[PDB]
Amino acid sequence: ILQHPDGTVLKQLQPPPRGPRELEFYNMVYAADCFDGVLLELRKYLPKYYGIWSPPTAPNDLYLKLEDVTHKFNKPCIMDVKIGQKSYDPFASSEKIQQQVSKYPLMEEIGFLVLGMRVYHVHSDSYETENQHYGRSLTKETIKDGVSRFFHNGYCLRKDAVAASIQKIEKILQWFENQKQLNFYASSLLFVYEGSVEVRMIDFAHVFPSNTIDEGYVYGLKHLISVLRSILDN
C-alpha cells in the first residue's frame, strides 16, 4: 500500500490469480451501469474506487487507486482485522488449506484475526505498532485484551470508539444478512479512530460468487461485536 498526498492509496495487484480477482471485484461493484441494490449498498462499506492505475511509462505495473480511509484523521489509530472462519477459498488445494489453517489454526473457533494495529499514544506523542505475529499469538483466553489494546488512547480506554465500532460493524453485518451472492475469504475490516470512526471492508483477492449466506463472515462479525461489547464493561 502506497499512501498518496491526494488522499488515495495505490494497492499493487498481488500476483495472479489474487490481484486480477480483486480488480474484477472492484470493477463489478463499481460498474457504472450497476443497478444491483446489494452491490450499490456494498459501496458504502468499501474504499471509494478510482479505477485501475498504472505509471505513465509502465503499463505492466498494475495498481488499484482506492480511497485512503485514514486520510480525514489527524492522528489515526488503525487496526486491520481479517474476518471469517476460513482464510482459504473454495478452490484451495489440500496444501493451500493446510498452509492457511497453519497460519492461524484458531480461525474457525474465533472467526477473526488481528493482522496489525497502529495506536497513537498522546502521552509519548508516538505510535505503538503490532505486526501479524501479535494477532496470531492471541487465543480465546487473550483475545479480549488483545483487541482492547487498540483502544488504549487519551489516558483511557476509548469506549466511545469501541461503541462506534460496534455500531458500524452492525451495519456491515446487516448487509451480509441481506445478501446471498458473495462470499468473502481472507478479507479484512479496517478500523480507524482519532487518536489526537471508520470501519471499512478491504482486501478482496478471495471474494467468490455464492448462493448462500456468508456464514463464516457473519460468525466473525458477531464474535467481534461480542468481544467489543464486553470491552464496554471494562
Ligand X SMILES: O=C(Nc1cccc(-c2onc3ccc(-c4nn[nH]n4)cc23)c1)C1CC1
94 is in an annotated binding site: no
Kindly tell me which of 145 and 215 has the beta carbon lying closer to ligand X.
145
Q: Does 19 bind ligand X (CB under 6 A)?
A: no
Beta bridge partners of 130: 117
Binding residues for ligand X, rule CB under 6 A, total 17
22 is in an annotated binding site: no
Kindly tell me which of 15 and 33 has the beta carbon lying closer to ligand X.
15
The pattern of x and - marking residues 192 through 211 that bind ligand X according to CB under 6 A reads ----------xx--------
Q: Contact with ligand X (CB under 6 A): which of 68, 89, 194, 214?
A: 68
CB of 210 to ligand X, least distance (A): 21
CB of 145 to ligand X, least distance (A): 18
Query: Apex CA 201: angle with CA 8 and CA 226, to 5°?
Result: 140
Question: Buried (b) or exposed (e) across 86-102, using 16+ Cβ within 10 A?
Answer: bbbbeebeeeeeeebbe
Kindly tell me which of 168 and 213 has the beta carbon lying closer to ligand X.
168
Q: Which stretch binds ligand X (CB under 6 A): 82-90, 116-124, 163-171, 225-233?
A: 116-124
Report how far residue 99's alpha carbon sits from residue 89's, in angstroms, rounded to the nearest whole number: 12
Q: Does 66 bind ligand X (CB under 6 A)?
A: yes
Kindly report the backbone phi and psi dihedral angles of residue 206, in degrees, each rounded to the nearest multiple of 5, phi listed first. -135, 50
202 is in an annotated binding site: no
Kindly report the backbone phi and psi dihedral angles of residue 185, in degrees, each rounded to the nearest multiple of 5, phi listed first. -115, 140
Q: What residue number has its CB nearest to ligand X?
A: 116
Q: Does 118 bind ligand X (CB under 6 A)?
A: yes
Confirm if 157 and 148 have CB atoms less than 8 A apart.
yes
| Cα dist from 212 to 87, 176, 182, 183, 202, whole Å | 18, 10, 8, 8, 21
Report how far residue 228's alpha carbon sits from residue 135's, in angstroms, rounded to the nearest whole number: 16
Known binding residues: 11, 18, 67-69, 80, 82, 96-103, 132, 203, 206
